[PDB]
Amino acid sequence: AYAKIINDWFRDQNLSSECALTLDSSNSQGSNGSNQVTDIQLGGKPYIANKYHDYFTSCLPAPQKGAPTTLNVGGMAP
Amino acid sequence: ARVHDFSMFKGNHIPRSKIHIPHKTIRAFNVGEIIPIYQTPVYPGEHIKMDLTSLYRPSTFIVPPMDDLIVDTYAFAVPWRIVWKDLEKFFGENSDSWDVKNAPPVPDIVAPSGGWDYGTLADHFGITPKVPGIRVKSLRFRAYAKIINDWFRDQNLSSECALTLDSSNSQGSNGSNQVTDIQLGGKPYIANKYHDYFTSCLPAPQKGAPTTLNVGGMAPDLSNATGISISDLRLAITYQHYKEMDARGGTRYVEFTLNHFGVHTADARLQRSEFLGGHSQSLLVQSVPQTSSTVEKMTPQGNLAAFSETMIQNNYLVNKTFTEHSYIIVLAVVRYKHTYQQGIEADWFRGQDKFDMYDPLLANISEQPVKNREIMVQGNSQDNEIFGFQEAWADLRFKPNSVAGVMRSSHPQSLDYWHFADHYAQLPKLSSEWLKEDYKNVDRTLALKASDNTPQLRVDFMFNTIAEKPMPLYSTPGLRRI
Amino acid sequence: SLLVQSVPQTSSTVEKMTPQGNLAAFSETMIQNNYLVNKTFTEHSYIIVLAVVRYKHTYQQGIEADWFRGQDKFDMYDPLLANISEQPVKNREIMVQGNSQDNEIFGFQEAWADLRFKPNSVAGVMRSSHPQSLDYWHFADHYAQLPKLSS
Amino acid sequence: DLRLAITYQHYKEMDARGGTRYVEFTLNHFGVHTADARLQRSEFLGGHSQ
Amino acid sequence: ARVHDFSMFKGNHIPRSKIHIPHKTIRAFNVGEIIPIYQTPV
Amino acid sequence: DLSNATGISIS
Amino acid sequence: ARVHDFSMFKGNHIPRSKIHIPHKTIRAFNVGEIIPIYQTPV
Amino acid sequence: KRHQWRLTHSARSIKRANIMPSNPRGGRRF
Amino acid sequence: KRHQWRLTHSARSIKRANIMPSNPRGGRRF
C-alpha cells in the first residue's frame, strides 16, 4: 500500500520508473536496501520526496514526449 | 506568503456539439437468447441520451396461448480499461521514465474457418457471417462476456465465461459452449429462467461444508477423550451463520459488502460493468377467428388462431455522461414464466408425525431439502432424494403454477400446444443446463417451428440518440494552431 | 411516406400453405398537395410536375469502421485530430470480402464521420445471403460484387 | 501529410506538459475529471502544509 | 399485474457504535524522507 | 540512391 | 419523425469591410461620342 | 363489461416495469 | 395504449415535410 501511494502521487513519471508493486499471493523477502525502485515494497529505506516545483525542477527531457516530428525525406536516385 | 508553484495550463479548449444519431436494425432470433442489439464507442466526456422503439413479431400461433411472453431490454457501459489491461499503456502511461516505447495494439479476433455462422454473437455485433479470413478488434466480444459475468451469470450452478484481459490475439469460434466460446463470438449466451420456487433452490443448506462439532477417536473403557468447550461451540455457530449468509446473498464482492456490512459499493469502484437502464414488458396476442367454411379433416369455422404484434417504447434507456473510454452495449432477451406438470407439491407428503407440520417454534430451522418428487415424480427410489435446498417452510409461501388433465404433455392426445409448461424426458438435476431458459416449450405452440429453422421472433429496433460529444460541429479540414 | 395496412389470414391452415393468422399487407395512401404552384410568370415557360418514390437504405454486408481502429493511439478519436483532412472509407465497410480489396478505398468522408453516423443494418436470418432468408421483410441492399462509388 | 505531422507534435507536447497517467490523459485531452477510485488509484483524504 | 419475484432478505441487523481511539507515537528521521506515521484497517 | 538527408522538424 | 439528412456546413466566415475609393480622370472628346469614363470589377 | 377485444389470451396480466439492480436469493442474476 | 390499428409495420416513423432547395454535402441533388 505504501508503494502504491508513491506510484499514484509522489513519483515523478518523467525522470524515474515506478516502485515495484506485486499484486500476487506469493510471499516476499524483506530488504534493508536503499534502492528507491525495488526495495520500497520490501520495507527498506523510506522513499525520498522530490523537491518542489521551480524553474529547474520543472524541466523535461525533450521538447515533446516522443521522438521529434519531422517531414519525410526520400533518398532515391536513378 | 505567496510564491510561484507550478500549476495547470488549463490545457486547450475542447470543442463540443450535440449530434442526433438515428439508427435502425432488423433482427431475428429465438426465445432465451441474449442478443446484442446496439453498440457504440464513447469517448471521455460524452453525454449520451438514448431512446429505443421496438416492434416484436413472433411466429404465428396455432391457437391463442394461455401463457405470456415477456421482453427485457438492458443497457450497459463497459470501460475499455476493465476489458483490457494495456489500455493505460496504450495512451502512454509508462511504468518507466518518459515516453512508452512499445505499446501493443488493440487485440484482434480472427474468424473461424468459413467465417462465423448465422445467429452467432459476431453476427449480431455486425460482423458479416460466412466471410473467412477476416479479423477484428476483440474488445467488444470481451465486453459482452464481462456483462454476463457481472450480471447474468448464476454463480451457484455454473462457472463464469472465459474473459482474457491480455494483449494477445484470439481465435473466433462457432461453438455453442456457454463458458469458453462467449468471448470468441459464438452462439449467444442463454438467459437463466426467472426466480421461482424451483429456480431458487441451492446446492447445499450453506455455502461450504456443513459445520459439525468435533469427535475424537482415541482409545487406550476409553480414557481421556476430553470434550467440547462452550467457546468452540460459539465458533462453530458463527461459522454456520457465515456460510448461510453467503448462500442467501451471493458471494460476489459487491454482494459480500451488502450482506455482511450493510453497505452499497459502487460498481465502477469494483471494476464491474455499469447498468444504465432497462425495461420489461409482455407481448400482445391478437386472436383471429376462422371465417372459411368447415372442411372435412380441417379446423371448423369459428376456430381461433393468433398473431402477435407489439410496439414497445423505451425512453431514457441511457441518460448519463462518461468519464473514460467505454463501450455502450444494449441487450434484449425474451423469456416466459414457468409452469410445472410433473411434480407433486410437498404438502401431500407431510404427516409422518406432528413435527412434519408447520409450527411457529420450527420457524427458524435450517434450509430444508426440496425432494425430486416435487419437480418430477417417478415412483422409484429417486423420489425421496434431494433436488435442491430452499428456505424452511417455503412451500407454504409458494404454489408453483400447474397443469392438469388433457392439457398436460404426457397425454397421448395432448392440448399442451395451448401453454408453455415444462416437459422433462428424465429427472432434471439442479444444474447450469436445467436453469437456462428453454425455447422448445414456446416452440410447440407455433405454426412454424424453430426446430424447422424458422426464427421465433422478428424484431425491428429504432434507436434515436442525442449525443453531446467533444467534437466540432462540422469537421472541416485545416487547423487553428501550427 | 406511404401507409401499409396488414391483413390477417382468416382461412384455415392447409398443408404446404400459410397458417391461419398469417399477415399479408396492402398499401393505400391519399396524399394532398395544396399550393403546389403559386406564382406569376413573366415569360413564355413550361410547368413540369415530377414524382418519384424512394426508400431509406440499410446495409447488411459491411463492418463499421470502428471495429478496425487500434493500431496505435492515433487511430482513436482525439480533439486534436478534429480538423485533419478527409479520410478514406474502406471497402470493408460497404462490403467485406476477406481479401486484399478490404483495405482499399471506396470513397472519402469528413474526418471521424463514422462517430457521427451508424448505418442501418440487418443481422441473422433477416439478411439476404442466408440459404433460407427472411429478407422479404425489408428493403436492404444486396451486392453480387464489391460496389464502386459511381453513377 | 503536413496536417498529420502538426497534430502529432501537438499531441506529444500536450503529453509532456500534463503528464501521461490515464487520470492525467483524460483531463488534458478531453477536459474531464475522472474519479481516483474508478481508476484504481489510492484516494487522497486530506493534507496540510506549514 | 403483480407476481412473486425473489428479493433481498434485507439481511441481518448490523450493530453500530462510535469509538474514540487516541494514539501517540514518537519518531525521529531526517529531511526529505516520506515517513508513515499512522496506519489502520478500515 | 542517397542515404540519410534527414528532414525538417515542426520546430 | 426526424432522421439525418445532410445539410450545408454554412461554409467559412467571409470577412467584410467598407472602403472609400476616390478616383479622378481627365478626358477630352467630341460631341456625340459615347465615352467610357469608369470601370471596375465587382 | 362483457364485450372486449381480440386481445384476451390469459387470466393473468403482466405489468410493464422499469428494471432495477436487485439482490434476490442466491446473488444477482437478471 | 396497447391496441392500435392495422397500420403498424415498423419501429421508425417518417414525418411529412415541405421540400426546400438545400445544399447538402457535394452539391445540390434532390
Residue numbers in the entry:
A (entry chain n): 152 to 229
B (entry chain h): 10 to 229, 292 to 553
C (entry chain i): 353 to 503
D (entry chain n): 303 to 352
E (entry chain n), G (entry chain Q): 10 to 51
F (entry chain S): 292 to 302
H (entry chain h2), I (entry chain i2): 9 to 38
Task: Please quote the authors directly.
Spiroplasma virus 4 (SpV4) is a bacteriophage of the Microviridae, which packages circular ssDNA within non-enveloped T = 1 icosahedral capsids. ORF1 expresses viral protein 1 (VP1), with a molecular weight of ~62 kDa, which is the major capsid protein. Lastly, VP8 encodes for an arginine–lysine-rich polypeptide that is analogous to the J-protein of phiX174 and is important for DNA packaging. A striking feature of the SpV4 capsid is the mushroom-like protrusions at the 3-fold axes, which is common among all members of the subfamily Gokushovirinae.
The observed order in the density map for the full capsids started at methionine 5 to the C-terminal isoleucine 553. The SpV4 VP1 structure consists of a core, eight-stranded, anti-parallel β-barrel motif, with β-BIDG forming the inner surface of the capsid and the β-CHEF situated above β-BIDG. The EF-loop subloops are primarily situated around the 2-fold symmetry axis of the capsid surface, with the exception of the subloop EF4 that forms the mushroom-like protrusion at the 3-fold symmetry axis. The HI subloops occupy the space between the icosahedral symmetry axes, whereas the FG loop forms the channel around the 5-fold symmetry axes. The 5-fold symmetry axis showed a pore with a diameter of 4.5 Å at its narrowest point. The VP8, DNA-binding protein was observed in the interior of both genome-filled and empty SpV4 capsids. For this short, highly positively charged protein with a calculated pI of 12.9, structural order was observed for aa9–38. The N-terminal eight amino acids were not ordered but based on the first ordered residue, they should be located near the 5-fold axis. Its C-terminal phenylalanine 38 is buried inside the capsid core, in a very highly hydrophobic region near the 2-fold symmetry axis between β-CHEF, αA, and αB.
